[PDB]
């Protein structure tokens, strides 16, 4: 067997059947004789390739495979990799290297010092020392991406390796099963359960690793047994809980003082599947108020190490959530009462308030819609106004890197063909990965893109307020016609300048058989 | 003084007056109270920001200053940095970091392990240990970018540093002059000159550092004195010689065997301002034939170290070219005869042959036009068909990273307001940095973009041929309307489906007062 | 509170009370006002400092704290760190940095790019962005070293930070409890147990993480229930099983073919707490023979990823060994029969055969002796001839880095004051960290050092044989008087030129109240 044949066999034996890519000369020997059972999804720029693969991996809850071109293709993807690192996305990033005979002279499109290029945004980064090692290196990449805490990995392969003879002993790689599905030992788990059972006013805080683990239903059971309010940890990349469940209390503000104030009076705060905490704005104060102690369950040693307070347990979130949900007592406290519905904001016949847009989306979208958020100044309103009952219903750029939601929405829609994906993206954010629209058109992936057009980088005007910063350049983005951009890439385009048009446009988009972009004229901040 | 005030003073004292940027919250304290004498050029995605700054630095022959947002903004620019590394572009890349009080907890948009992120594509990468150190760190960044061999550098600055008190001793940074304008000592330079004077059939090979140094006219004088043919080193990022001068012999093929064959019979080959050599395709053979010896003058130790043959001198290209041009004897050999004009390719009333497009550009463009090339399958024809008499007339992605030419053309046009810039970009390449069009519209930078639309990644179909690779996915890019993309970003758009329309469109574009995009329907490969 | 006071409070609250160090100017502000409840152990060179701390951490099964001087002190320790990485030793390495005001100018003993210096041999490496962050960074270092898989970490601290005011919120760091004491979920653990219960001829292979976890007794119970032979994985850094238990089968040869041959006919091979596998010599063949399947339990994702065969479970070794030992059925197969005693090698009245030395050590040493091995050509004989009944009885350089055993023996003896430590070290190996002897003398740590003096690098003469390499320089080390070296550092010294003298010397050493070095004249290979 060749290294080519062996490597594709390893990939299919490990469940991988799709390559998200933008091709180059160093990858042609890998992509040639492309196997019939695989599919290749082309995107026109590498931030888009990785974004699509990332949405696909997060929604499918399995690794996604990426093929990029040498240093320039990998470099174009590095902002996308920053998000993937923070969302623990299991991404296997492969990049083609020059032929081994011309690496030394640094021929054009040699990836120099290749393994160092994507650091520090990958769990593992490597170039094999010989062609016969390639399948073993690929095996390492698959398992490193897939073991808790999941994350992106990088493998650089000289293009001449693929046609070489594989090692016959590589067959032992094909069926390896590697598990990190672990939970706290019985004695210490009993101690934790007793602390939860004994708490007089527990609170629960959930992060993205709950949704990645599909631990959402177990966390519902846990919250109901403990009769405890549930918050989502700040800067949330996913939604880990039904947002209209009686225990749900919403997204935490991303500030130190704000969070300790919210938790005040809670004696035990159990955090599951989140960093402690992904603050954003600087809001100095107490990490916790007196009387509050914190216990964190995290799949990531790096999270447990850097928490500035609390105890921590490093374990699989699925296994831990299930064990806790099944072991805790039913408290005799009263179940928390559901948060009230949000108020209707006054809306005239002109430009749309974001609140109106979210209320209308909530009124019209299917109950199993999946949303993406890259409309940064409207996040709080989005979380208050969209009823998201099911797991996998929300994605937001985990490292704050714009250019995620547009391509990720396409990968999510590819992963979940029977759930309507609706990406809500600001006019500024829409440009970072605009060319991803083309992939939705070409493969007819029927994502709906709602562009919130207010002409400005609104969130940065806000943060300028908290910093009290005046005379800042570069905050306005006038003069972009998103319907023309959508036409340019073959996506049906609609405009909504008022509520009547928003309703009509959503009705058309929801009914459409292909992707649709709706440009919404929203109010300026 | 504050760190803010001191740093802008240092920048203006060192000749920097423009910030190319895409802003974020960590940069607001740097960008606030933006100085009246500076200008900020916004681009909508960071590959575009760096591309624009890169074209501006290469054309202006001075450092360009960039401000990006933390890890995600830096990561989005890393493909652009790969080109900048290979073209020795003096780029000062600054990125905002979280406030020092929240770096430890890794708050959202903390740039973790920041200095390692852009490696290995920068000469120097750093985050200062205190706010008062920021001006000195900026001084280091300016000089590291600007000293031979020039190249990109990276500085990460926590956002709280700007408002802190500066060290009063920072004033000693303001007027530092640092020179690398050096040449080989007299005794060894005399030995080199004697070897050139004694050669029976010398050849000259020139690379991009000649054009960066504006050493072109000196290299003309050198070639005329030595009566020597002149080639451009392969994978050329710039044009270092007038392409219709009698000595000019064109762009070398990027292959080992091809180059040794071309040089056969030349006893001394003097290479100036190029790597030896930037091969691309694998074309194994002799590095040089018997009877040929090579001498390389390079500004870059890394180039001198990795050459697989020849002697080398590491020195400033401007200083060396001037010294050699003035010291060599006038040979009594006959001057080389000019290459013949290229033939006219048969052209019917349908889709355009690339040869026709270049002939027509050469017929209509001003004599001081500046071209950019990201139409990878037509490079040989472009070099044969465009008469480029003047320095600074050609740019091509130095690391082969697509997404350079579109934004770089805007930076070049900003640097050279009286020279018409014409970027010739393939339909595939146009997408990587498509959003850069917006910056040309907003600032009315009148670049002309000629999109060569053949529906496919043509060069990759070629390289597939040399590799003999069949059943490769992802090579076609149908279904993109570039006039709609240009409209989307506010750029006037024209279509050329045949020669009559190409001529009309060029006439309109040349006359236009703003940027113009022409979509040309070219023949499929 | 100051950063100094807060950091020592954090260290004592986290169980750390000893600093192993070699001091320098950047560390004086940390070491001043040294707390009364701490102890400082000086060694004269940094390989010795880290070796001592490493032996102390491995034997105590808890993190050890190290303080080195800037880049030069850290660099002198990097070979020692290579061993620590491979043995998963929880080492907190701190190094002093220049004052923040002189880092930029790179004053003498600035640690440039400090965090990158010890990579890739540390789990985490960091320099804080401000003085107030130091206690949180130290908290991160403690937990990163201590979480599974344990390993060395690095923290660089500017010397001016210690006197600065601490953040009052740092108190939340003091009592953090972080656990990685996890095991496979119940459903999958039941599947594993069923596979073990069903095996017709299981084998067990144990590595160093079993002894680190004190999982030895549980592994005895497991082997007895399964009636299974037990081997120690190759290149063994520790001893995980009583070597005269009936199931024990010895140390595996460090070769691919040798191991698959040894395992042939075993249907299920359970590996616990080892890489799969730490081969040394190149011995190509099948990784496993047909009919053998492998299951690995490892605390280290990097081990699970790179195994070339088998399934793997990433979990705590203590928790997994206990669960398996208590859950498996008692097999009705016959218990394995103990290996026979090794034969007595013929010994005349001259130089000692290594076999004689080990037999004599086994005859005279206490049953709870602890041995270290850095006599590389005699390892097989050592493993056959020393009855090691108890956990923590054997250490060998985990990365093969010489200079470990001499200082580690001192740290082990410091950790286990009531167990006689006997380090058996070749004459070549003894020199790498010879100055460590001084620390044993000064603190009266009564380690016994047995120098096996055959005048040559014996193992390298062997490996030269397997490679069939002739005319190799640098293999002989004549002319070293180890009794004089011991005298030089204040350690009692004895010589053993024959068996009578070996017996007398051991009797004296065993009775001595201080450290003793015995130079043994052994036979040449
Ligand atoms: C890759 C990248 N570049 C720059 C930023 C900085 N940034 C920028 C530029 C924002 C403006 C977003 O504008 P929008 O139109 O998409 O949405 P809003 O108007 O609601 O803010 S929010 C933010 O953090 C970023 N986060 N990521
Ligand atoms: C960032 C990046 N991604 C991928 C490539 C690989 N690549 C690709 C995708 C090419 C196709 C260029 O297509 P085009 O339409 O712009 O021009 P041609 O049709 O003349 O080839 S040429 C080439 O090297 C690259 N060089 N850089
Ligand atoms: C730091 C370091 N340097 C060099 C070596 C190479 N090396 C060397 C030099 C050996 C000779 C050991 O000689 P010895 O006298 O201690 O023992 P033997 O005679 O039994 O081999 S074994 C070995 O791997 C090493 N392992 N570690
Ligand atoms: Ca906006
Ligand atoms: Ca094309
Ligand atoms: Ca020896
Ligand atoms: Na990097």
CSV table of C-alpha atoms in Angstrom, one decimal, chain C residues 52-282:
chain,number,residue,atom,x,y,z
C,52,UNK,CA,17.8,16.4,43.9
C,53,UNK,CA,14.3,18.0,43.6
C,54,UNK,CA,13.3,15.4,41.1
C,55,UNK,CA,14.2,12.4,43.3
C,56,UNK,CA,12.5,14.2,46.2
C,57,UNK,CA,9.3,14.7,44.2
C,58,UNK,CA,9.2,11.2,42.8
C,59,UNK,CA,9.8,9.5,46.2
C,60,UNK,CA,7.4,11.9,48.1
C,61,UNK,CA,4.7,11.7,45.4
C,62,UNK,CA,4.2,15.4,45.7
C,63,UNK,CA,5.5,18.5,43.9
C,64,UNK,CA,8.9,19.9,44.5
C,65,UNK,CA,9.8,23.6,44.3
C,66,UNK,CA,13.0,24.8,42.6
C,67,UNK,CA,14.6,28.2,42.3
C,68,UNK,CA,17.3,28.8,39.6
C,69,UNK,CA,19.1,31.9,38.3
C,70,UNK,CA,17.9,33.3,35.0
C,71,UNK,CA,18.8,31.8,31.7
C,72,UNK,CA,22.2,30.4,32.5
C,73,UNK,CA,20.9,28.6,35.7
C,74,UNK,CA,17.8,27.3,33.8
C,75,UNK,CA,19.9,26.2,30.9
C,76,UNK,CA,22.3,24.3,33.1
C,77,UNK,CA,19.3,22.3,34.3
C,78,UNK,CA,17.7,21.5,30.9
C,79,UNK,CA,19.2,17.9,30.7
C,80,UNK,CA,17.7,17.2,34.1
C,81,UNK,CA,14.4,18.6,32.9
C,82,UNK,CA,14.4,16.1,30.0
C,83,UNK,CA,14.4,13.3,32.5
C,84,UNK,CA,11.6,15.0,34.6
C,85,UNK,CA,9.4,15.3,31.5
C,86,UNK,CA,9.6,11.6,30.8
C,87,UNK,CA,9.1,10.5,34.4
C,88,UNK,CA,6.0,12.9,34.8
C,89,UNK,CA,7.8,14.5,37.8
C,90,UNK,CA,5.8,17.4,39.3
C,91,UNK,CA,8.5,20.1,39.4
C,92,UNK,CA,7.8,23.8,39.9
C,93,UNK,CA,10.8,25.5,38.4
C,94,UNK,CA,11.1,29.2,39.1
C,95,UNK,CA,13.9,31.4,37.7
C,96,UNK,CA,14.7,35.0,38.6
C,97,UNK,CA,14.5,37.6,35.8
C,98,UNK,CA,16.1,41.0,35.6
C,99,UNK,CA,14.2,44.0,37.1
C,100,UNK,CA,11.4,45.1,34.7
C,101,UNK,CA,13.1,48.4,34.1
C,102,UNK,CA,16.2,46.7,32.5
C,103,UNK,CA,14.6,43.9,30.6
C,104,UNK,CA,14.3,46.0,27.4
C,105,UNK,CA,17.9,47.0,27.2
C,106,UNK,CA,18.9,43.3,27.9
C,107,UNK,CA,21.1,44.0,30.9
C,108,UNK,CA,23.4,41.2,32.0
C,109,UNK,CA,21.3,38.2,33.2
C,110,UNK,CA,18.2,39.2,31.5
C,111,UNK,CA,16.5,35.9,30.5
C,112,UNK,CA,15.5,36.7,27.0
C,113,UNK,CA,12.4,35.1,25.6
C,114,UNK,CA,12.3,33.4,29.0
C,115,UNK,CA,9.2,31.2,28.5
C,116,UNK,CA,10.6,29.7,25.4
C,117,UNK,CA,13.9,28.6,27.0
C,118,UNK,CA,12.8,25.4,28.7
C,119,UNK,CA,10.4,24.3,25.9
C,120,UNK,CA,9.7,21.6,24.9
C,121,UNK,CA,10.5,20.0,28.2
C,122,UNK,CA,7.8,21.6,30.4
C,123,UNK,CA,4.0,21.4,30.6
C,124,UNK,CA,3.6,25.1,31.1
C,125,UNK,CA,6.0,28.0,30.9
C,126,UNK,CA,5.3,31.6,31.7
C,127,UNK,CA,6.4,35.1,32.8
C,128,UNK,CA,3.8,37.3,34.4
C,129,UNK,CA,2.8,40.6,32.9
C,130,UNK,CA,2.9,42.5,36.3
C,131,UNK,CA,4.0,42.0,39.9
C,132,UNK,CA,0.5,41.6,41.3
C,133,UNK,CA,-0.1,38.7,38.9
C,134,UNK,CA,2.8,36.7,40.4
C,135,UNK,CA,0.8,34.8,43.1
C,136,UNK,CA,-1.8,33.8,40.5
C,137,UNK,CA,1.0,32.7,38.1
C,138,UNK,CA,2.5,30.6,40.9
C,139,UNK,CA,-0.9,29.0,41.6
C,140,UNK,CA,-1.1,28.1,37.9
C,141,UNK,CA,2.4,26.6,38.1
C,142,UNK,CA,1.5,24.5,41.2
C,143,UNK,CA,-1.6,23.1,39.7
C,144,UNK,CA,-0.1,22.5,36.2
C,145,UNK,CA,2.8,20.5,37.7
C,146,UNK,CA,0.4,18.5,40.0
C,147,UNK,CA,-2.5,17.6,37.6
C,148,UNK,CA,-2.3,14.4,35.6
C,149,UNK,CA,-0.2,13.8,33.7
C,150,UNK,CA,2.2,15.4,36.2
C,151,UNK,CA,5.3,17.2,34.9
C,152,UNK,CA,7.7,20.1,35.2
C,153,UNK,CA,6.6,23.7,34.7
C,154,UNK,CA,8.5,27.0,34.5
C,155,UNK,CA,7.8,30.4,35.9
C,156,UNK,CA,10.1,33.4,35.3
C,157,UNK,CA,9.8,36.3,37.8
C,158,UNK,CA,11.3,39.8,37.5
C,159,UNK,CA,13.2,40.5,40.7
C,160,UNK,CA,11.5,43.8,41.4
C,161,UNK,CA,8.0,42.1,41.6
C,162,UNK,CA,8.5,40.6,45.1
C,163,UNK,CA,8.4,43.8,47.1
C,164,UNK,CA,5.3,45.2,45.3
C,165,UNK,CA,1.8,45.1,46.8
C,166,UNK,CA,-0.1,41.9,46.3
C,167,UNK,CA,-3.7,42.0,45.0
C,168,UNK,CA,-6.0,41.4,48.1
C,169,UNK,CA,-8.1,39.1,46.0
C,170,UNK,CA,-5.1,36.6,45.8
C,171,UNK,CA,-6.3,35.0,49.0
C,172,UNK,CA,-8.8,33.0,47.0
C,173,UNK,CA,-5.8,31.1,45.6
C,174,UNK,CA,-4.5,29.8,48.9
C,175,UNK,CA,-6.8,26.8,49.5
C,176,UNK,CA,-7.8,25.8,46.0
C,177,UNK,CA,-8.1,22.0,45.6
C,178,UNK,CA,-7.8,20.7,42.1
C,179,UNK,CA,-8.4,17.0,41.3
C,180,UNK,CA,-7.6,14.8,38.4
C,181,UNK,CA,-8.4,11.6,40.3
C,182,UNK,CA,-10.7,10.2,37.6
C,183,UNK,CA,-11.6,6.8,36.1
C,184,UNK,CA,-13.4,5.4,33.2
C,185,UNK,CA,-17.2,5.7,33.3
C,186,UNK,CA,-19.2,2.7,34.7
C,187,UNK,CA,-20.6,1.4,31.4
C,188,UNK,CA,-17.2,1.4,29.6
C,189,UNK,CA,-15.4,0.2,32.7
C,190,UNK,CA,-17.8,-2.8,32.9
C,191,UNK,CA,-17.0,-3.5,29.2
C,192,UNK,CA,-13.2,-3.5,30.0
C,193,UNK,CA,-13.7,-5.7,33.1
C,194,UNK,CA,-15.7,-8.2,31.0
C,195,UNK,CA,-12.8,-8.3,28.4
C,196,UNK,CA,-10.3,-9.0,31.2
C,197,UNK,CA,-12.6,-11.7,32.8
C,198,UNK,CA,-13.0,-13.3,29.4
C,199,UNK,CA,-9.4,-13.4,28.4
C,200,UNK,CA,-7.9,-16.9,28.1
C,201,UNK,CA,-4.3,-15.9,28.6
C,202,UNK,CA,-4.0,-12.2,29.7
C,203,UNK,CA,-0.7,-10.5,30.4
C,204,UNK,CA,-0.1,-7.3,32.3
C,205,UNK,CA,2.6,-4.7,31.5
C,206,UNK,CA,3.3,-1.9,34.1
C,207,UNK,CA,5.1,1.4,33.9
C,208,UNK,CA,6.4,4.1,36.1
C,209,UNK,CA,3.1,5.9,36.6
C,210,UNK,CA,1.9,2.8,38.7
C,211,UNK,CA,4.7,3.4,41.2
C,212,UNK,CA,4.1,7.2,41.1
C,213,UNK,CA,0.5,6.5,42.0
C,214,UNK,CA,1.4,4.0,44.7
C,215,UNK,CA,-0.9,1.7,42.6
C,216,UNK,CA,1.6,-1.2,43.1
C,217,UNK,CA,-0.5,-3.2,45.7
C,218,UNK,CA,-3.6,-2.8,43.6
C,219,UNK,CA,-1.7,-4.1,40.6
C,220,UNK,CA,-0.6,-7.1,42.7
C,221,UNK,CA,-4.2,-7.8,43.5
C,222,UNK,CA,-5.2,-7.4,39.8
C,223,UNK,CA,-2.4,-9.8,38.6
C,224,UNK,CA,-3.4,-12.4,41.3
C,225,UNK,CA,-7.1,-12.3,40.3
C,226,UNK,CA,-6.3,-12.5,36.6
C,227,UNK,CA,-3.6,-15.1,37.3
C,228,UNK,CA,-1.5,-13.1,34.8
C,229,UNK,CA,2.2,-12.7,34.3
C,230,UNK,CA,3.4,-9.1,34.9
C,231,UNK,CA,6.2,-7.4,33.0
C,232,UNK,CA,7.7,-3.9,33.5
C,233,UNK,CA,7.5,-1.7,30.4
C,234,UNK,CA,11.0,-1.1,28.7
C,235,UNK,CA,13.4,1.7,29.7
C,236,UNK,CA,11.8,1.6,33.1
C,237,UNK,CA,12.1,4.8,35.2
C,238,UNK,CA,10.6,3.1,38.4
C,239,UNK,CA,9.7,-0.3,39.7
C,240,UNK,CA,5.9,-0.9,39.8
C,241,UNK,CA,5.7,-4.4,41.2
C,242,UNK,CA,7.4,-6.7,43.8
C,243,UNK,CA,10.2,-8.4,41.8
C,244,UNK,CA,9.9,-11.7,43.6
C,245,UNK,CA,6.1,-12.0,43.4
C,246,UNK,CA,5.1,-15.2,41.6
C,247,UNK,CA,3.6,-13.3,38.7
C,248,UNK,CA,6.6,-11.1,38.0
C,249,UNK,CA,8.4,-11.7,34.7
C,250,UNK,CA,11.0,-8.9,34.7
C,251,UNK,CA,11.9,-5.9,32.6
C,252,UNK,CA,10.9,-6.1,28.9
C,253,UNK,CA,13.7,-5.7,26.3
C,254,UNK,CA,13.4,-2.3,24.7
C,255,UNK,CA,12.8,-3.6,21.1
C,256,UNK,CA,9.7,-3.8,18.9
C,257,UNK,CA,10.3,-7.4,17.7
C,258,UNK,CA,11.4,-8.6,21.1
C,259,UNK,CA,8.3,-7.4,22.8
C,260,UNK,CA,5.8,-8.8,20.2
C,261,UNK,CA,7.6,-12.1,20.6
C,262,UNK,CA,7.4,-12.0,24.4
C,263,UNK,CA,3.6,-11.2,24.2
C,264,UNK,CA,2.9,-13.9,21.5
C,265,UNK,CA,0.1,-16.2,22.6
C,266,UNK,CA,-1.3,-13.7,25.1
C,267,UNK,CA,-4.8,-12.7,23.9
C,268,UNK,CA,-5.2,-9.5,25.9
C,269,UNK,CA,-2.3,-7.5,27.1
C,270,UNK,CA,-3.2,-4.8,29.6
C,271,UNK,CA,-0.7,-2.0,29.9
C,272,UNK,CA,-1.0,0.3,32.9
C,273,UNK,CA,0.9,3.6,33.5
C,274,UNK,CA,3.5,3.2,30.7
C,275,UNK,CA,4.0,4.6,27.2
C,276,UNK,CA,3.4,2.0,24.5
C,277,UNK,CA,6.4,1.5,24.3
C,278,UNK,CA,9.7,3.2,25.3
C,279,UNK,CA,11.8,1.2,22.9
C,280,UNK,CA,15.5,2.0,22.6
C,281,UNK,CA,17.4,-0.2,20.2
C,282,UNK,CA,16.0,-0.5,16.7
